Amino acid sequence: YLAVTPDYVPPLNSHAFFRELDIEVFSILHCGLVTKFILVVQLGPPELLFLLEDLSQKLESMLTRNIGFSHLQQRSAQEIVHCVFQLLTPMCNHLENIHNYFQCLAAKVQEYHIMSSCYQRLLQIFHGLFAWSGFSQPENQNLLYSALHVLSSRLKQSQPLEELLSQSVHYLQNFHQSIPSFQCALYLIRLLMVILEKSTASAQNKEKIASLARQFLCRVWPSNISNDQLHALLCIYLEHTESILKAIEEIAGVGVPELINSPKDASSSTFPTLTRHTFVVFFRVMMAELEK
């Protein structure tokens, strides 16, 4: 009925007109997830997306106008992150289940889209949680340690802090294979960087960020990729690679020539994300990075 109704004003931008959900509503995320395809009353894929979308918007409003967030703003950011932290364990479980979901599609369509949105919402929540300016303060480092210990406990369980980061990154990096969309890959990449920021030694940390970034660039993403997101990924790959000059030489000296020889509606073999329509993004990043 919204489609047949262009002009109409709802009685008193969904958050502007819909009632705010309490922060305690997300406590029902402890329910498991079951899908109709390729896997009492239990949480469904559309219901999970509804809860994840609302939680992501709440985090984006404080950690990253007041209409639709009056009750949320009435609690300080310290409690909101702490409240989300209590959701970490049931929320990593949803990520693992969806990760196991996409792996089984190695060998209906609306279900795929809903789970894809759920995957991206989880990573955005995960990234927004750890990438909080409050973690720079020393008072809540214990809270950060507890969050990092949760991820490290998903594989094997007063450990040293650096061990938690290495384990947490290793646990999260395993999700790259299951990622179904470019936006999810960018969210995982950004999530890895903010965690690796806490680690002082980044000689190898830069390479694993760069190696993962190149793999996403070289992957054949099914078709959707926006130039803004592709621009963001190129900056991450170039700023983190060991030799930016050799990286630029490879894209411009190998990737671009084979793009020209390829058909008009085609892409580079080495860089499938490099087509005639996205060349400007590659060119703009390479020139800007070279100048920097």
CA dist 43 and 141 (Å) reads 33
Way the structure was solved: cryo-EM
Which of 145, 142, 18, 139 is CA-nearest to residue 69?
18
CA dist 129 and 254 (Å) reads 39
Resolution to 1 decimal, in Å? 2.8
CA dist 76 and 65 (Å) reads 16
